[PDB]
Structure formats: C-alpha cells, structure tokens
Motif scaffolding. Structure first.
Motif, PDB file in Angstrom:
ATOM      1  N   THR A 106     -25.603 -29.561   6.312  1.00  0.00           N
ATOM      2  CA  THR A 106     -26.935 -30.181   6.346  1.00  0.00           C
ATOM      3  C   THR A 106     -27.865 -30.043   5.088  1.00  0.00           C
ATOM      4  O   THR A 106     -28.103 -28.946   4.591  1.00  0.00           O
ATOM      5  N   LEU A 107     -28.372 -31.116   4.589  1.00  0.00           N
ATOM      6  CA  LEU A 107     -29.321 -31.253   3.551  1.00  0.00           C
ATOM      7  C   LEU A 107     -30.698 -31.379   3.978  1.00  0.00           C
ATOM      8  O   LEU A 107     -31.052 -31.713   5.200  1.00  0.00           O
ATOM      9  N   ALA A 108     -31.834 -31.197   3.026  1.00  0.00           N
ATOM     10  CA  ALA A 108     -33.234 -31.491   3.576  1.00  0.00           C
ATOM     11  C   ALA A 108     -33.275 -32.970   3.958  1.00  0.00           C
ATOM     12  O   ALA A 108     -32.544 -33.923   3.608  1.00  0.00           O
ATOM     13  N   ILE A 109     -34.343 -32.981   4.598  1.00  0.00           N
ATOM     14  CA  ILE A 109     -35.043 -34.184   5.087  1.00  0.00           C
ATOM     15  C   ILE A 109     -35.182 -35.002   3.901  1.00  0.00           C
ATOM     16  O   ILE A 109     -35.968 -34.733   3.183  1.00  0.00           O
ATOM     17  N   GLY A 110     -34.686 -36.524   3.915  1.00  0.00           N
ATOM     18  CA  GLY A 110     -35.121 -37.370   3.069  1.00  0.00           C
ATOM     19  C   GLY A 110     -34.465 -37.578   1.737  1.00  0.00           C
ATOM     20  O   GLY A 110     -33.281 -37.050   1.609  1.00  0.00           O
ATOM     21  N   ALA A 111     -35.145 -38.090   0.819  1.00  0.00           N
ATOM     22  CA  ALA A 111     -34.412 -38.483  -0.429  1.00  0.00           C
ATOM     23  C   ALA A 111     -33.966 -37.188  -1.197  1.00  0.00           C
ATOM     24  O   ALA A 111     -32.739 -37.332  -1.811  1.00  0.00           O
ATOM     25  N   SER A 112     -34.458 -36.047  -0.905  1.00  0.00           N
ATOM     26  CA  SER A 112     -33.960 -34.790  -1.566  1.00  0.00           C
ATOM     27  C   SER A 112     -32.758 -34.493  -1.277  1.00  0.00           C
ATOM     28  O   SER A 112     -32.051 -33.849  -1.652  1.00  0.00           O
ATOM     29  N   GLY A 113     -32.527 -34.577   0.141  1.00  0.00           N
ATOM     30  CA  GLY A 113     -31.288 -34.231   0.823  1.00  0.00           C
ATOM     31  C   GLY A 113     -30.274 -35.249   0.466  1.00  0.00           C
ATOM     32  O   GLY A 113     -29.202 -34.656   0.448  1.00  0.00           O
ATOM     33  N   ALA A 114     -30.558 -36.473   0.305  1.00  0.00           N
ATOM     34  CA  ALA A 114     -29.520 -37.467  -0.059  1.00  0.00           C
ATOM     35  C   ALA A 114     -29.285 -37.152  -1.626  1.00  0.00           C
ATOM     36  O   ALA A 114     -27.755 -37.084  -1.873  1.00  0.00           O
ATOM     37  N   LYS A 115     -29.954 -36.746  -2.454  1.00  0.00           N
ATOM     38  CA  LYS A 115     -29.518 -36.191  -3.873  1.00  0.00           C
ATOM     39  C   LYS A 115     -28.794 -35.204  -3.724  1.00  0.00           C
ATOM     40  O   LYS A 115     -27.647 -35.147  -4.569  1.00  0.00           O
ATOM     41  N   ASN A 116     -29.192 -34.192  -2.977  1.00  0.00           N
ATOM     42  CA  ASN A 116     -28.606 -32.923  -2.846  1.00  0.00           C
ATOM     43  C   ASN A 116     -27.250 -32.899  -2.222  1.00  0.00           C
ATOM     44  O   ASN A 116     -26.285 -32.330  -2.410  1.00  0.00           O
ATOM     45  N   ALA A 117     -26.941 -33.899  -1.126  1.00  0.00           N
ATOM     46  CA  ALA A 117     -25.495 -34.046  -0.363  1.00  0.00           C
ATOM     47  C   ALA A 117     -24.611 -34.627  -1.616  1.00  0.00           C
ATOM     48  O   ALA A 117     -23.505 -34.115  -1.685  1.00  0.00           O
ATOM     49  N   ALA A 118     -25.159 -35.732  -2.479  1.00  0.00           N
ATOM     50  CA  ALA A 118     -24.178 -36.118  -3.574  1.00  0.00           C
ATOM     51  C   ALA A 118     -23.852 -34.813  -4.545  1.00  0.00           C
ATOM     52  O   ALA A 118     -22.741 -34.897  -4.799  1.00  0.00           O
ATOM     53  N   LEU A 119     -24.777 -34.037  -4.980  1.00  0.00           N
ATOM     54  CA  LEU A 119     -24.873 -32.846  -5.599  1.00  0.00           C
ATOM     55  C   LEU A 119     -23.853 -31.858  -5.039  1.00  0.00           C
ATOM     56  O   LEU A 119     -22.893 -31.477  -5.730  1.00  0.00           O
ATOM     57  N   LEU A 120     -24.045 -31.653  -3.757  1.00  0.00           N
ATOM     58  CA  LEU A 120     -23.013 -30.683  -2.987  1.00  0.00           C
ATOM     59  C   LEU A 120     -21.740 -31.522  -2.976  1.00  0.00           C
ATOM     60  O   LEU A 120     -20.635 -30.656  -3.260  1.00  0.00           O
ATOM     61  N   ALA A 121     -21.591 -32.580  -2.758  1.00  0.00           N
ATOM     62  CA  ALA A 121     -20.157 -33.203  -2.840  1.00  0.00           C
ATOM     63  C   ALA A 121     -19.677 -33.088  -4.254  1.00  0.00           C
ATOM     64  O   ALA A 121     -18.322 -33.010  -4.449  1.00  0.00           O
TER      65      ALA A 121
END
Lengths: 160, 160, 160, 160, 160, 160, 160, 160
Positions: free
Chosen positions: B113-128
């Motif tokens: 799980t990543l952060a709430i919101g846009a930061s999380g979406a960016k970080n999900a892509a970086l984690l992928a």
C-alpha cells in the motif's frame, strides 16, 4: 546461499512481529538475512546498509518499525531496491502512528506498506516472494503451491 | 509493446489520482495498460482480469480505489502477481477509509500500500519500476537516473 | 427446513462474533445456514455463493469480516439480495478498520452495516428478521413478541 | 399510490443528501413519502411517525441525520420495521460523528447503516428496493435491470 | 552574523509554513539560516547537515516536514543539539500523519514537537529563542519584551 | 426528601460508571433518584420521564449512555431542564462513539457533556451541584468547602 | 442591567463562533458580558476574571477556545460557578483537538461541554438559560416559548 | 546543588510516567526538583511556581499531564523558560487527548511536546539535557558519551 531479502528492524522487541516474515521466507526457501538496524540510534549503520544492499545482492528489503516509524522510509531514501514496510503495533496508539509514519511517503520515494502487526510481517514476506517469483520459476511454482493450498485448506463451516 | 504493468481503478473519477501512475510509467518507458475495473460494479470483470493477468504477461498490478476500497485486495485474491494499492482520497473521510480498507489485509494475501492520493499513485509506479528493475538492466539504469535527478534537483534554499 | 438467511464469515475466529447472529435466528425460528467463505482466500467460492444465493432460496445474507473487511461488499457485488455487514473487532484498530471497510460502500452497491462486534451480529439477525417479517405474518408476530418482551424486561432501577 | 417507504430527515439542510434516496426510489417506481422529522426538535412527531408506520402500510424507513445523529435509532426504537440509517456529512467532523451515532446501536434495536453522504442515501434506497423485491416480482425485475445496467455501463478505459 | 539556529524543511511547499519561523527569528534578531533539506530525496545532505551543525556553531535546529515526516527525527539521530519539529499540514490527513510521525519518537532521541502548521512554526522559533535566552542576556530581554507586548496587546472585548 | 436531580442510564452495566455521580450527590447532601431508562428499549418510559421531570420537581438530569448514546440527547428533547451527559466507555471504541453521540448536538437542544467514564460521572454530579448552588446557599457553602478541601489536599511532591 | 452570564474567548477570531452565544442570550433577554480572555496570553486576566466572577454576580460562564483549548478548564479551576465550554473549530483538526482539550476534564473540576462550532455556542447559551430558568420564572417562561416555537416551526416536508 | 530543571505533574499517578524523566536527569547529573502541581486543583500553586521559576534559577520545566492536559501550556503562559510537555497515557483514549491538549498550542506560547508515555518522559529529560549542554561543557561531554554509548550498544541481530 547468499541472501536476496534483508529483514531489518530497530529493536529486539520488534522481532516478536518480524519473526513472522523470517519464518515465511524460510518456508518458501528464500535465502535472507535478519538484522537489527535502528534509524534513530544507528543512523550511519542504516545509511551503509541501505546504500550497499543492491551491490551485496539483496533484491528486496523488508523493514519493520513502530511509533515514529522512520526505518522503512529512510532505507528507501538510500536504496533503489523495493522496500516493504511493516508497522509494528505500538503500546498507546496501537500502531496507528506506525502505520501513518510508514505509508504516507511523499511522491518520489516509495515504501510498499503492509498491515499493522504479524499479518503485515507475513504479508511482507509473501509480497517479497511474489516479486522474486517474477524472475525465479522454481520459486514461482512454490508460491503457486502455497497459494493453492491456502485456498484449498479453508473449511466450509465453522465449529460451535 | 506488450504491457507489463496494469493500472486499474474503479471509476473515471479515480483517474484524477491514478493518472499520476500512468504518467510515471510513461516517463520511465514501462509498457502498461490503464483500465477501469470496478470491484463492486464489475466483479466478474475483476475476477477475469486478475486471474489472467500473469498469463497475459503482466508482472505488477497497480490498483486504486476509494471509500470501502476493495479493488486491490480482491485483485490480489485472484493473482499471484504483486499488487500495489493506492488509496484514493474520499470526500468525507479524506482517504482514511480508503487507506484502512486497503492496507489492513490479513496474513496470506498481500497488498503493498502507498500513500493516500497522487503521491501514492506516483509511488506505486515507482515501486513497480523498482520491482521490474530487478530483472531489466536498461530499466534499472533509467530508474537510477530518475532517482539521481530527483536527489540532485532539490534546491538548497527556499524562494520567497 | 430450507435456509432463508445465509450467515457467512471468513474464518473460524469470526464465529465468536457471528455465533450471536446464528443464535438469534434460531430463537426466532428462522431457518438458515452458517458457513465459512473467505473473500481473500476463497474468492471463487464467494462468487459462486453470492451469485447463486437467490436461486437457492436465500432472502438475506449476513456477512461478517474484520480488518480489510471485504466479504460483505463483494457478496453484495454479486447478489441482488440485501446484504447485512457485521464488522468484526480487530486486534490493533478495534474494528475501526472493519467498520470503515464495510460501511463506506460507494453509491450503487449497498451493505446495511451494523455495530462492531457481538451487538452488530445480534442486530444483523434482528434486522434480517424484520425484513422477513414483511412477508411472513407468523414471524412478524414472533418478532413483535420479542420486541415487546425486550421492552417489558428492562428494570426500573440499578442495583448497588 | 400509497407509500411503502418513508424517507425522513431532521432538517431542510439534510435534503441535499437525502434527495438522492428520493430520486432513486422514484427511478425504481417505489411509492414513498419524504418528510422532515427532527429527533431533537420534534420528538413527539417522531414517536407518532414511527409507532404508526407499519399500520399505515410502510415497509421500510430510511432516516438521515448528522452530528449527534439520533433519528434512525429512535425511529427503530418505536417501529418493528427495518430502519436504514444515512449519516449526513457534518461540517467539522465530516460525518464521523454521524456515522458512529448511527451504526453503534446496542444489541436489540438495529439500524442498517449506509455510507456517509450522498452515496449512503442512494444505497439506502437501493437496499430498501432489495428488501421490497423479495415479495414484489415486478420490482425485483426492475432492480435486476438497474443492477445489470449499472454493471454494463462501466467503461473499460478512462478518458483524459 | 553567524547563524545559531537552522531552519530546515523538505520542500519549497513547506516554506509557506516554515516562513513563520524565519520571520519570528528575524523579529527577535536571532541569526539563522533557512534551508531545504529533504530526508527522503537528499538523505546524505541531511546526514552531513546534522552531523556538522554543532561544529558550525548552530545551537538549535527547527525542522518542518509533512506526511511521513522523518526530517526532524533523522536530524536528531545525527546531532546532539536540540531539535524542534514542526508538523506541516498535509492535504488529506491535515497534518495528523505529520504530527504522529514527528512526536512519537522512542526513548533516546528526542524531538520537541510543536503544533500543526503556522502556529507550530512560530512557536518553534519562540521555543528556540527561549532556549538561547538562557545564555544570552540581551536576547532574554528582547524575548521578555515580546511576551509582555503579546500579553498587553490582547483586547478586552471583541469587535463586531 | 424529594429528589432534585435525576440520574438515568440505559442498563445495569452503566451503573459501574454512574455510581460515581450517585455517590457525589450523596456526599454533598443533594436528594436525587437513580433509575434505569433505556432510550432504545424503553422509549415511551424515556418520553414520560423527561416530559414530567420538571413538574415532579427535578432541576437537573444526569444521563449516561454508551455506544450510539442517545439517552441524554433525547431526554433534552423533551425537557426544558438542563441535561448533563456522561459518555460511558464502550468496549471497542473506548467511548469515542459515546462521546461524539452525546456532545455533537445540533444547535437548539443542548446537552452539557462531561468526560468519558467515571471522571465524567463525578463531574456531572459536581456540575449539577454548582447549578443548584446558585439558588441554595447551604449547598453553595458545602460545595465551597468541597472545592477548598480538594485544593488543600493536593500533595506537594510525589512518592518514589 | 448587571450581567449574570459571562461569555469569554481567547481571541477576536473566536468571536465568529461565540457571537452565536451572545445573540441567543440577547434574544432571551439575559444580561451578559462578552469579553476576550486568553488563557495562554493573559493568564493573570483569566485568574482574576474567574476568581471574582461570583462576587460580581455572574452565575454562569460560557468559555470558547480552540486547539489546545485550556480557557474553559482553567476558568473552572478558579470559580465555583458552572462553566460551559465551546470547542472552536480549528483549521487542521477541525475542532477535534478543541473538543478533547475541553471535555476530558479529570474528576473534581467540571466543564459542561457543547458541540464543536456555532451549534455549541448557541447551545451553551441555551444551557445557561435553562440553568438560570430554575430560579427566574419570567425567563423560564421565555425559554418555554423559545423551545415551543423551535418545535412548532419545523416544516413537515422538504423544499426542492 | 540548586535545581536547574523542574519536573512537575498533577498527581501521584502521573509519577509512574514522570519517574523516567527524574531518573534520566539523575543519570546525567543534572540537579532538579520533582513536584506535584495540579493545573485544575491547585491553579494558584501553578501560577506561583511558573511565575517564579526563572528567578529561582530553573532553566527548563518538564510538565506531564493526561486527559485534558493543561499543566504544560499554563506553565508556559506564566514563564519565559522553555517548557517541555509529556502526554501521560489516559485510560480511555490512550493519551490521544493528552497529546492534542499539549501539542496544539496556538502561536505565541510554545510547549515542546514529546511522545505519549514513558518514552516521552525520558526524551523530555534528554531534550532538557541537550538545552543545558549548550552552556555547560561538562554536561555536553556527558551527553555526548550517553549518545555514543546508546549508538554503540545496539545489537546487530535479533535473538530467536
């Protein structure tokens, strides 16, 4: 065999939680190392650990911390490897502080966060396994077997 | 090029958040698909998407949802692939419901799980990206460059 | 007699809570079935259970789950029947995660949510009874008797 | 046609939320009444409304309230009918007060609780429809059509 | 004049908050530096800044961060100087994540934490002033004057 | 002597908390009655109790409730007397549901709310005493003595 | 006419909330004073105000504060009069800090706490009125009229 | 030797937490006094304590309180010295009320707040030491030794 996952935590007391990650990696035959690294009391140990992880052959870091839980995020700041974070249940706030301290990373430096406590530690190991399985067919088969057995083993009715 | 990451979300309104994952994968030249899959309105679409993801050649799924956010967890129930979950900010509870619904998975079926919101979406892509980088050297070098630029670009002093 | 309410839960440990629903249905002479169905570990079992419930003659489903509590909402995604959700108290967050995961369903797919824990399980059974009573006069009379007795049985002063 | 669902709310300001329940019942052609009944300002109006609801031919009550939200629970105290509760979003606490005040009913007197805000109001109407559908075949077919269209209408990809 | 307080923050967007600390130190004529240091994007910059702070002649560090707010705690891990932490208001959780991430430091490495947002930034500067005043008599007199004026300036009645 | 304060609660289990109010009123020689009145299970008993309180000579009502705690607010809806509310600690949410259910009354119908648990019950009695003291000089003197003794009895240093 | 209620608040910005108490007392023709008294900036002003309130002829104090809201509790520490506390909505935490800081008084020194924001300010004035009404028959009749009109004025149906 | 730090708390029960501050100051050879001062039950004792602290030679005040925790903030209102606040864990809300009551001070009057419970008490002492060390070289060396030993003493691996 050389470790491919590092499990790190700030204290011996965290191991009551993180032992569940250790056990799951062993069950799936994933070589790993399990260490104490304190973000707040051994910050240079952390910097060195994280900065050298990839060159030492680690592929995934699982980091557990509680309270003001900075270990996973600071590990991620220094390594390009995927870092998975386990919030350790804290005494007063029951891991809500741990969780928010780990999961709310700003855009740019990810930590994949799992549930508070032992469930999260087990799942961090399983998530690490699913990552490694993408380029290890033998492990992929062991993980498939694990998931299928988990599904097949669920009872159909509860006992009174 | 055939997609190796799937970005899924329950509704068009979630795309305001999940577009940040899409953009990051494009920046790093990671082939991906970006789709709407609703856990609650299209559960059979979800079951099929998740069951077949690995055989289609996907390696990571990034799933975003808000409120009673079940999409990431149900995706993980049907695939052996790593599933990353992005809590979308909800109107009333500002994503606290999204976050707890995603991160608190019981042991056996993980969602990173990543952060709430846009930061999380960016970080999900970086984690992928960091997952894929483990077995894609060209991508690993692009990810190194991304992180190095991010670090080098931070100003030393604030502007008035 | 053929069941008209299905009580489902993800694990044996949930039955400590859901047994209160089971007992109340029996007290009101409502035929029912009580089963283990795991959203995360047996998702195809859930899909089949929910998709066939109405044709099997069920009228109401009572679903209990804790943590990232997805069972009630995913059951509702596949059935047109009313689904009632019972948040099971979780260890760290005391059912706040369970509650938000169940009650915060987006518009379009309802779950009628009851209180955290045993009170909620009892009340899910009573709510199911009040639904069934709308087209079963004998049950309506039994429910009337139950409510009247509950009211008449409240003491007038506490004991020191 | 005589109403079979009552939608009640404490104030005119609650109608911005509860109008979504009204609209859904109209879409499904479910005869209903939409009224203001304040638990705190018109408690005798409430007592009379709830006591007489069943004899008037109502089958389900949908009640919305915010803050210290007592309307659904007090309605349930006086009627044997199923009562569905919609937490209205409050200014300061964004409906967290509304939600806990409604959902946490002790064992013996249920309120089936829906999500905070407009989603909850829509879902309360859909839940009422699914209850009525159990003994109204024409409505059951309209509800099937509603759910089928909802499912079929979900796009496959997001728009920029 | 050589700085005796360092004000650091992770990003330019934090300056909207941290400028209130800068302004207060200027008002009290306390020499200071105001810098961007990101715990997550520039961890080696942080390590160097904190390690060398005392030898450079800094006496107090004021650090602001939001979300998973690690900057104050990691600064404290590397310096023996008092570190004061300002939780920056985050978009979704309104600084509750910032606050818990900063204040809940385990025993051994302190961060003196101030209120969320601008009030906290102002108060961090005032707290730094009160520390410096203990061994700077001219400053102590200016701080006395500041507090006396603050007290004397409070109106006796509100304006319409 | 005829009661001038009514202490009411929904269940015997609440008396573990409300006994502290009972004891304090007795200590200050304030005649009172202590009763069980359930908002949800005996709503007509509540209506009658509250509507007739003033004519029976009560001046203050102290009402305790937990969970979806509606007793104080509904008492206030029917009486013109001051109503003081005591949130009873609940099992899962530790009285946070009790507190919000009682204190968040909309404008127009007040409940003066005290702390969660035994402290609140004691303080509801003391607040009732301070109200009664405004028109009972003998009680005012007893309350003065109580407050002065409380102040004089605080030790100067702790024991190791 | 000499004031019998004191309305106090820490700052001019609190008056946007506390003006609703002022207006209600004026509507009911209750003589009062409306003042700024800051617990943190004017603690000696507070000590004097509270110590002398009863001898000046005040009967009730209504105190509003936000954030770390200490004004009501410190007022209660110095006066034997009933003190009513209004949590002012804070920017970040929306008055949750205000509320807990006011309501959670330990046993021995009460503050009767009202809802967050304008509703609480109105209700603090109404609660003060209900206290004064116990020994002022003309006011008691005006308060009866106020409550009767409030009840009678509630519409029966919402407007579109 | 004359005290340079004052440790104050409202009750004997708080000493279970504040004893950790007392012990740490003794370990670092910092002369101090440890006293009971109740904000709510001995407000004039508090005013005198805080107003005279600096002239008595105190340099730092460490104040612990729970619930509606007003002691640190009111101490800060009367002294120009740095005040450090320790939230004491409360029974129901586990110190969340303590924390918000202490840390959320409005701009103008600071309290440097530490973690909930024993960790916070230890860290308040360490923060006081780091303040005093700025103008006491012998203490600075003892604090350096303490920090270095803390770092050197962290084990490298956990025990199973």
């Amino acid at each position: 065999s050389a470790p491919v996952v590092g499990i790190i935590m700030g204290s011996q007391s965290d191991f009551e939680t993180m032992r569940h990650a250790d056990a799951l990696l062993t069950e799936l035959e994933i070589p790993h190392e399990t260490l104490i690294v304190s973000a707040h009391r051994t910050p240079d140990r952390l910097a060195d650990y994280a900065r050298t992880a990839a060159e030492r052959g680690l592929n995934v870091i699982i980091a557990g911390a509680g309270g003001a839980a900075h270990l996973p995020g600071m590990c991620a700041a220094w390594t390009r490897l995927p870092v998975l974070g386990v919030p350790v249940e804290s005494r007063a706030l029951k891991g809500m502080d741990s969780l928010l301290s780990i999961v709310q990373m700003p855009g740019g430096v990810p930590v994949g966060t799992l549930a508070i406590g032992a469930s999260g530690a087990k799942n961090a190991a399983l998530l690490a396994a699913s990552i490694l399985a993408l380029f290890n067919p033998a492990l992929a088969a062991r993980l498939e077997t694990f998931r299928a057995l988990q599904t097949a083993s669920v009872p159909n009715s509860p006992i009174t």
